[PDB]
Each structure stands twice: as C-alpha cells, then as structure tokens.
C-alpha cells in the first residue's frame, strides 16, 4: 500500500581516529514522526568491520566491533566495542597432533573500561623432529597459561583503551606471549583471539570528541 522506504534516511558511519580509513559505510533509519526519535534508534548499533577495511596493510582475519555512541547531523560516531577472529582462521589453526593452550583475563583500563581478553596458542613441531606428536605436559601448560595471563594483565591495566586498541591492531600482545614462552615450550599461532566489553564508564561527549579529533 504505502512504501516503508519512502520515509527512510541514510546516515554515514565513521570509525575512531585510531584507524586510517574513517568512512566504514552507510546505514538507514526511519525519520522522526514525533513518536520515535531517529537518533535513539540510530544509537546502539554494532558494526563488524574487517581490519583490512580499516587499515590498508593489516591482516583481514581480524575483525573489530564498533558501536555507535553519538549522532552529529548525518554522521554516526562509533567507538571500540570488541575484537574477534574469523571462523576459518580458527578452524585452520586447530590441528590434530599438537596441544592447544587457552587463557582468559578480566582487566580494567585506566579510564574505566572493563575488558575480557582471550588468548590461544599451539605447540610447535621442531625442524628436525622425528616424533609425530608435539605434546606439552600439564605443568608446562599451566606455566604457559600463567605467562599468558600475566602478560595480558600488564598490558591493559597500565594503559587506556586508546593505547589498548593500538596494541591490538598489530597484536603485539600475542608476539610478546609467543616470545616469552619459548623457554617453557615453543609456541606458534599465538593470538589474542577475542576481546569482550564488560563495563563502560558513564558517557562523556568530550571523551568521544577527543577520540575522533
């Protein structure tokens, strides 16, 4: 009868200043009829963007969730909301004749953002190894997991969210963990695979504007 798309309007969504590319696409919303405000429906949306669409030279198997925080006249302003890996990357990392070690921590940044970080690593076969399997004993696994947890804790609570995302973009935490665990048992494919937002501080417009410039 009456076209629902005649009352729709298009908005442009921007990424925070941490990333090179800022315009991450467009979105749609119904105009305000006085009952429902377009801004209210516009806020709270989550966008999963591949890192290769945010930074030119970075990998594409790392995705970032960005949540719209404020609307500035046809410009949705997003903020960091999460990070994850693609399904096929994780499926290809897990293989049958090796050990997998996983860890998770709950760390609060200096500016109030509470995060839950997950880390995964795999034991590596030696260059001249003749034995088919590469298994780490339980105490070695526990030591590796504790080394993961302490490194992930010391790289978040000291910094703030802006510096945390900067470390996440090349995933320097995984490289630090991989280097630190060489003495216990060699590890390859060490990554921080998921990051969850648990608690946010009270919303501040000035903080958002400093985050976007």
């Amino acid at each position: 009868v009456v076209d629902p798309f005649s009352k729709k309007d298009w908005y442009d969504v921007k990424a925070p200043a941490m990333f090179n590319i800022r315009n991450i696409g467009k979105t749609l919303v119904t105009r305000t009829q006085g009952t429902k405000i377009a801004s209210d429906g516009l806020k709270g949306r989550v966008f999963e963007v591949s890192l290769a669409d945010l930074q030119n030279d970075e990998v594409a198997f790392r995705k970032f969730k960005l949540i719209t925080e404020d609307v500035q006249g046809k410009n949705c302003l997003t903020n960091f909301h999460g990070m994850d890996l693609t399904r096929d990357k994780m499926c290809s990392m897990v293989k049958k004749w090796q050990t997998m070690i996983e860890a998770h921590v709950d760390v609060k940044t200096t500016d109030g953002y509470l995060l839950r970080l997950f880390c995964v690593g795999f034991t590596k076969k030696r260059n001249n190894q003749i034995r088919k399997t590469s298994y780490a004993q339980h105490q070695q696994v526990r030591q590796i997991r504790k080394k993961m947890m302490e490194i992930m804790t010391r790289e978040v609570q000291t910094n703030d969210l802006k510096e945390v995302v900067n470390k996440l973009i090349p995933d320097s935490i995984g490289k630090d963990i991989e280097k630190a665990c060489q003495s216990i048992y060699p590890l390859h494919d060490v990554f921080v695979r998921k990051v969850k937002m648990l608690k946010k501080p009270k919303f501040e417009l000035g903080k958002l504007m400093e985050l976007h410039g």
Binding site: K26, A60, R87
Partner: protein, 135 residues
C-alpha cells in the same frame, strides 16, 4: 531514492544466506544488520514443499532480492553463509551455492564471505533417541 554516492564508490550491504535442507533464505540488511532491505524465501517462488530447498527456487529468490536491493541503491554485498547448526548438521543446504551464483549473475558486487553457522561448545540432547532415525 537512496544514498547519494558517486559512481566509483560502492554501497555495501550484508547478505545472510540460510541454506537448510527444507528451505532457503536470502536476507539483505545494512552493515549493522538491524535494518532489512529485502528478504525472499525459497518457498515464495515454488508452490510445492519438495522444491523449497531446490537450487531453482534459490536462484529465483536471489534474482528477486538482487533486483529489489538494486532498486534501493545497494551495489555490493557481504556474504554470511549459515547452516541450521546447533545439534543438527553443519553442512549447508543444496541452495546456498546456487543462490550465491545467481546473486553474482545479477550484477551485484561480492564482498567478503564468512561462515556464521552456530557451533556449540556443548549442547542439549539431540532429537532421535539412542538408536537414531530408522526411517
């Protein structure tokens, strides 16, 4: 009617393809997945319960949804392929590949493909019993 975008740039959407063994869904949403552009199911094309999952119905639904979203102003689509998941099979139905190929035929640009089948860490008991479905 749509975004004001230069000819060079592509307007992007996300296509959720649900390929079951009984039906096929091609759904188009914005990048946030909260706004629906067009949803066409394989059961809308064929008037039979056998052919809802057939490759032909998937091809028809893909063309219909491609035309509808081309009307509004979406030129490229990201692909999220989904199976039924859960306790049941993780293998996509026979309409996924045909729907994707038909969507490519209609002139749509293709973004990144991603498998989004729900995978439990462990789940509730599956339907069927100890001895399974004996047909």
């Amino acid at each position: 009617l749509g975004p004001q975008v230069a000819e060079g740039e592509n307007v992007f959407g996300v296509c959720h393809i649900f390929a079951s063994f009984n039906d096929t869904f091609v759904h188009v949403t914005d990048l946030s997945g909260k706004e629906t552009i067009c949803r066409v199911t394989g059961g809308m094309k064929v008037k039979a319960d056998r052919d809802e999952s057939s490759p032909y119905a998937a091809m028809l639904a893909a063309q219909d949804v491609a035309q509808r979203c081309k009307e509004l102003g979406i030129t490229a689509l990201h692909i999220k392929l989904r199976a039924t998941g859960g306790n049941r099979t993780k293998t996509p139905g026979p309409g996924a590949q045909s729907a994707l190929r038909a969507l490519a035929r209609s002139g749509m640009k293709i973004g990144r493909i991603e498998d989004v089948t729900p995978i439990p860490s462990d789940s509730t008991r599956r339907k069927g019993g100890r001895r399974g479905r004996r047909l």
